Symmetry: C2
């Protein structure tokens, strides 16, 4: 395990739909302006990012970076197609390399399967292929001082693990010291038996947190029991990354936004949303 | 509007994954055993129902029947392909005919689009095509004393309407006296700004209700603010069908279950689930 600290991050797609030179400056300036400790960069295509320019931007705005991504059908490490697993391994190493290059310590999100709506349930071979891939990734990450955090997402985004309890079981099969559980209030709101059970069960195994409202808009305008969730984090004295995650048709990444079915505009003012989000969070945890 | 009354029902998939002679009896017996007033039949293929056998089963167990369905890509009434919209019209009239033969009064569910994940947001033409299809269905249903209830579902299941407010606007465009809004607490838990706003807004336009827990499992083991929702229903003095809807890998309809991403086993004992659900509901609304 590599060092974790209580720090507050904003997801790139709060500010930018793409990670062009401009997009990168806008998001990084955005997060720094709002008072975030770090930006979480979406690395669905880790070859299109200008790492040197991004590194300069992080220096310029005195801001840290972690990275999240979701694999695609072409890079699905659950695939019983060895070629498709190899493409996944290759993308996760590239993502790890980019993250290392930016002085990052956390690779999180849906890194263990294709992000999206599977047409049917996962076979044991799908899960087995997933476990073996996170072992290979954890071993590669470990050489570069990087922790991986597997994000438990709802039934429409993965067939592998939809609850923290399922994630902890999968993690025990992975059995790597730098592999952790990643919980997201948005996904918890759908799948979990209250907002506390998975956090209490995780303890030190919880390595990353996403704060998202039930509809993924303004914090406090949805159904998520944040009082419950933040109570649970306190009970295990959680000290790791907490990134605000939000999606509106206002800022769209052609792939990720349609994958996440972001059909409505829940906000327009990135700075208002991000500023209010960090306030909301620090009021209830810190 | 055709007569509505405050009556309690269970969704077929609580007991049975198919509507074979055996599956129909199992669902109807299950509903009757728990003390439900009606069974809600999933009619995704209305041609496969043995209507006489089902009619005999309802008589035998002294149970009423309502019908819910989702369209598929092949029958999507939002399609810009006129042949696909005509297929939709044809299926919805077969569903209506079936319901009519069972002496039914409510065709509800995702009757206005293909149930599932859309690759992108709905155009005005998609919505216009939908409204016109629901107008044609409503006029056909009216001749057979059948109301249609438009079920608002989360972003992963439709790109047409994701909140009650959006559903009410769609509903006003349809402008038919036997057309109503259908709310489902499972979908509400995701998309809605609290559990009261859409219900207070709907008043007499709310024609049909589904009771689903946040994870579609045991009522009261999830995140759904039922106390808020039932307080809202009381405010508008709702007197219509209330269906307990639940999905577990324990009982699989090969199509519906996978379309709804039912990866997890949230129950095994249909009778225990269904019995506790009705009690839970009648305790909070009666
Ligand atoms: Mn997330
Ligand atoms: Mn429903």
């Amino acid at each position: 395990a590599f060092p974790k600290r209580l720090e507050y991050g904003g997801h790139a797609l709060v500010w930018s739909g793409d990670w062009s030179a401009a997009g990168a400056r806008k998001a990084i300036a955005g997060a720094a302006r709002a008072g975030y400790d770090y930006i979480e960069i979406a690395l669905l295509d880790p070859w299109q990012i200008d790492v040197a320019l991004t590194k300069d931007l992080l220096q310029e705005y005195n801001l840290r970076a972690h990275a999240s991504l979701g694999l695609s059908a072409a890079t699905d490490v659950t695939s019983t197609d060895p070629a498709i697993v190899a493409k996944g391994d290759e993308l996760l190493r590239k993502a790890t390399d980019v993250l290392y290059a930016l002085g990052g310590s956390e690779l999180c999100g849906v890194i263990y399967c294709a992000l999206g709506k599977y047409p049917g349930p996962a076979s044991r071979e799908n899960r087995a292929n997933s476990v073996a891939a996170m072992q290979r990734l954890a071993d590669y990450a470990a050489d570069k001082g990087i922790n991986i955090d597997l994000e438990v997402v709802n039934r429409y985004e993965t067939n592998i693990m939809n609850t923290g309890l399922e994630g902890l079981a999968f993690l025990d099969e992975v059995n790597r010291p730098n592999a952790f559980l990643h919980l997201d209030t948005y996904h918890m709101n759908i799948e979990e038996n209250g907002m506390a059970k998975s956090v209490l069960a995780a303890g030190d195994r919880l390595g990353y947190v996403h704060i998202g409202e039930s509809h993924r808009g303004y914090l406090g305008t949805g159904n998520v029991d944040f009082a419950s969730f933040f109570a649970a984090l306190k009970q295990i004295d959680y000290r790791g990354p907490i990134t605000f995650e939000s999606f509106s048709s206002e800022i769209v990444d052609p792939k990720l936004s349609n994958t996440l079915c972001v059909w409505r505009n829940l906000w327009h003012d990135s700075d208002d949303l991000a500023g209010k989000a960090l306030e909301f969070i620090k009021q209830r945890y810190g």
